[PDB]
mmCIF file of C-alpha atoms and ligand atoms in Angstrom:
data_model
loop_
_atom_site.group_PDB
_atom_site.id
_atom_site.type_symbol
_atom_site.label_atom_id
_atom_site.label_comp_id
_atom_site.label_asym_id
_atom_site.label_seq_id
_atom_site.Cartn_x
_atom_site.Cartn_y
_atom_site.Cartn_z
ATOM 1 C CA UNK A 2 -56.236 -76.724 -10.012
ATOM 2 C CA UNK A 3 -58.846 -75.671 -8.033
ATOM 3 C CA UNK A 4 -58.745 -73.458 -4.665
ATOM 4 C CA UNK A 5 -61.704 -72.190 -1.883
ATOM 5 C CA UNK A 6 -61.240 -70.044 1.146
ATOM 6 C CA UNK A 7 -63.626 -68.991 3.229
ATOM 7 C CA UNK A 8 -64.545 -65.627 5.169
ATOM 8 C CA UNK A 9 -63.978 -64.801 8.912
ATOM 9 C CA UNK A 10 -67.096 -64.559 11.039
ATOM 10 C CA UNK A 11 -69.422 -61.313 11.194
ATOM 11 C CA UNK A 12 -68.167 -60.297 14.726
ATOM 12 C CA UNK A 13 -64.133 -61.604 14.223
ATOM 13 C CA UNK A 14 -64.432 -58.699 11.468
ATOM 14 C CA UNK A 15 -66.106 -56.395 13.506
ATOM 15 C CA UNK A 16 -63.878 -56.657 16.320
ATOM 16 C CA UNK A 17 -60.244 -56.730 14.323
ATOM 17 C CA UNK A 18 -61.647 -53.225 12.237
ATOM 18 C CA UNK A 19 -63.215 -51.444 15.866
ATOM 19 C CA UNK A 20 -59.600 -53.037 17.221
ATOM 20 C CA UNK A 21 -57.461 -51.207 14.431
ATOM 21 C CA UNK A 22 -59.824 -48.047 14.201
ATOM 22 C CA UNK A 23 -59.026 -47.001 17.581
ATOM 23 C CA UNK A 24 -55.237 -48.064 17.944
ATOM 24 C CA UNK A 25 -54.538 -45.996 14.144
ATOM 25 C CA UNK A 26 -57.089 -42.814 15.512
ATOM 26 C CA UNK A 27 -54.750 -42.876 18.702
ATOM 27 C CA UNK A 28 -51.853 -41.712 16.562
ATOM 28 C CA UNK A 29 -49.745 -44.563 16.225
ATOM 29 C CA UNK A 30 -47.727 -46.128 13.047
ATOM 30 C CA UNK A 31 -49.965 -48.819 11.241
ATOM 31 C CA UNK A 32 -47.445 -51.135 11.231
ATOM 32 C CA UNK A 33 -47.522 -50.953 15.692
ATOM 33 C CA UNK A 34 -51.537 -50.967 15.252
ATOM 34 C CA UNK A 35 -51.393 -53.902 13.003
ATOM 35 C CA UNK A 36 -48.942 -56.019 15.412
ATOM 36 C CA UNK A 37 -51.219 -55.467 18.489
ATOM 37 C CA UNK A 38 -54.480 -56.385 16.510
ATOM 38 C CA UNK A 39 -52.696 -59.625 15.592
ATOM 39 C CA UNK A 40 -51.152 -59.945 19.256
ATOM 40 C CA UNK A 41 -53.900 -59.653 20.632
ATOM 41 C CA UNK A 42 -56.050 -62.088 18.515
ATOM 42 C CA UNK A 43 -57.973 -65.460 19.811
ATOM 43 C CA UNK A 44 -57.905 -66.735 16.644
ATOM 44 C CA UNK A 45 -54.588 -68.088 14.871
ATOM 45 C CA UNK A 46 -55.839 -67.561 11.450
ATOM 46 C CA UNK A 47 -56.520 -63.525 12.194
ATOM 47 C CA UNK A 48 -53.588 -63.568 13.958
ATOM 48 C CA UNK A 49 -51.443 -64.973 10.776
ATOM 49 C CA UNK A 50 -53.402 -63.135 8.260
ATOM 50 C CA UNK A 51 -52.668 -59.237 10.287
ATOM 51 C CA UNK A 52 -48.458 -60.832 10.461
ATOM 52 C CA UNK A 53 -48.912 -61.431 6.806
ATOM 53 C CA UNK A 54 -51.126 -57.981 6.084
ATOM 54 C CA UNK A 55 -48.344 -56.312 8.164
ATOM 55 C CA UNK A 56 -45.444 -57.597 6.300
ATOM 56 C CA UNK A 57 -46.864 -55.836 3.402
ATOM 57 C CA UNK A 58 -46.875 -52.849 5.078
ATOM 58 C CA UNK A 59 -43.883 -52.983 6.191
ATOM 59 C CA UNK A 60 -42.357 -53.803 2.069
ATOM 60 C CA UNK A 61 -43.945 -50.148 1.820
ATOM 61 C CA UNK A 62 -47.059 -51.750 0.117
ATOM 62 C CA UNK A 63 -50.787 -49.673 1.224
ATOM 63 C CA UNK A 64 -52.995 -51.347 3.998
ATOM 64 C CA UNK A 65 -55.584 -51.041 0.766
ATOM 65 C CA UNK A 66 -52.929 -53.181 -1.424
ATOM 66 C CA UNK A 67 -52.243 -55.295 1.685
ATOM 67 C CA UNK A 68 -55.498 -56.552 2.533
ATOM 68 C CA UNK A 69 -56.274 -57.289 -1.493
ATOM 69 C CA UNK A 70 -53.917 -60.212 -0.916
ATOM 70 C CA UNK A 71 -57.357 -61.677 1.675
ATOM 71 C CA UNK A 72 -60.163 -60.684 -0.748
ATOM 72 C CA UNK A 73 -62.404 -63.416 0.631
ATOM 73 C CA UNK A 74 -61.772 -61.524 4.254
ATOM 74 C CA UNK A 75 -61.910 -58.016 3.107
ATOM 75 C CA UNK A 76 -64.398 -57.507 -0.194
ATOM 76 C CA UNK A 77 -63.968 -55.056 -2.939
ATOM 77 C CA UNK A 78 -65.795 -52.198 -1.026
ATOM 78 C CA UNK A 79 -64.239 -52.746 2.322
ATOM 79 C CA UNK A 80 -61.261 -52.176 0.425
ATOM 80 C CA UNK A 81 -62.241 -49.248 -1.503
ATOM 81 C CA UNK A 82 -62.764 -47.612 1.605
ATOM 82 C CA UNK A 83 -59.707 -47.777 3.089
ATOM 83 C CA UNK A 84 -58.105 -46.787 -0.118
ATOM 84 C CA UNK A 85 -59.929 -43.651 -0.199
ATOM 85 C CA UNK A 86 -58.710 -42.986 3.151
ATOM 86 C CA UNK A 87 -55.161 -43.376 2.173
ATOM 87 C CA UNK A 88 -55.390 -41.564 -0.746
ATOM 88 C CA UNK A 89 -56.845 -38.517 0.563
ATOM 89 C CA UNK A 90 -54.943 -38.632 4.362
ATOM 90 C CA UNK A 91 -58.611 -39.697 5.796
ATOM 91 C CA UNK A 92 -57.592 -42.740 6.946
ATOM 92 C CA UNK A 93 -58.443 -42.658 10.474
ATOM 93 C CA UNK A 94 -61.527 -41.503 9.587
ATOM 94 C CA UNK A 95 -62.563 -43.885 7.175
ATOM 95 C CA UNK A 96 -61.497 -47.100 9.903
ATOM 96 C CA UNK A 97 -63.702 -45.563 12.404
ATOM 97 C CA UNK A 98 -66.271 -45.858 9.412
ATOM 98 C CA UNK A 99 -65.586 -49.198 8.651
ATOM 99 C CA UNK A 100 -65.494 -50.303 12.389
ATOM 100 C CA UNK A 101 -69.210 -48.925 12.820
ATOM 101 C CA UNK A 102 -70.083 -50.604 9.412
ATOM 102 C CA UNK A 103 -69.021 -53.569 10.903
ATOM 103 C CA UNK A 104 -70.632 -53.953 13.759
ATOM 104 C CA UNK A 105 -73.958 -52.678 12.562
ATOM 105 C CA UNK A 106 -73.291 -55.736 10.015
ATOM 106 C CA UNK A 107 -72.326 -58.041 13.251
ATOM 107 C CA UNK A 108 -75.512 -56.919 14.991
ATOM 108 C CA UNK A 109 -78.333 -57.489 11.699
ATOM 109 C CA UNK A 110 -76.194 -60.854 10.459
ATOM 110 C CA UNK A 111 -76.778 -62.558 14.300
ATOM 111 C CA UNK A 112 -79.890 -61.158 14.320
ATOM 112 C CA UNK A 113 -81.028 -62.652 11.540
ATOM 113 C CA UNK A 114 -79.594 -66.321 11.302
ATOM 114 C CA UNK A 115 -80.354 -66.165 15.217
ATOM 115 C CA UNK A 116 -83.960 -65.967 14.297
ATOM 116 C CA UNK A 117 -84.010 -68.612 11.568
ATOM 117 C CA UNK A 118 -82.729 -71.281 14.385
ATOM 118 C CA UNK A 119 -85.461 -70.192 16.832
ATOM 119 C CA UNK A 120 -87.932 -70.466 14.504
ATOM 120 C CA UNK A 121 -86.711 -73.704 12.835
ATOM 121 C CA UNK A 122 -86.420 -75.052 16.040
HETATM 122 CA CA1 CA B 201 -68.214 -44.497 15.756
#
């Protein structure tokens, strides 16, 4: 029947994509940036998600194709970006985007629902 999953929080993203962005910009294989990510997680259900995003990989699918399998982690443009990378050999590039992206989100999301509490309260 029916099915709802939910997000990960505004800085888990923005750490796993800085996290990723600088391991893939150093020059190693995806597949060894993806593992450490996910090795070096807090969180058990980033940690599963990157083993199960890796595997993926790893069958030869795209980290674009991969993460479509956690569209309520990753949204359409997210993933647009990183397809762009891939397709054009920018992908390094285009992760260091998305990291920055991500924690400028991280940084006006707290900001804001940080401010509704305070005043609320
Ligand atoms: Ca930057």
């Amino acid at each position: 029947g029916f099915a709802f999953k939910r997000g990960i929080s505004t800085p888990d993203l923005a750490l796993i994509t800085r996290q990723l962005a600088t391991l893939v910009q150093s020059g190693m294989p995806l597949e060894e940036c993806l593992r450490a990510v996910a090795e070096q997680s807090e969180k058990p259900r980033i940690r599963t998600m990157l083993v199960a995003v890796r595997a993926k990989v790893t069958e030869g699918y795209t980290l674009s194709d991969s993460l479509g399998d956690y569209p309520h982690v990753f949204d359409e443009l997210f993933r647009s970006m990183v397809a762009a990378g891939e397709k054009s050999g920018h992908l390094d590039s285009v992760l260091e985007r998305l990291a920055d992206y991500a924690e400028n989100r991280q940084k006006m999301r707290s900001k804001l629902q940080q401010a509704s509490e305070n005043l609320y309260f």
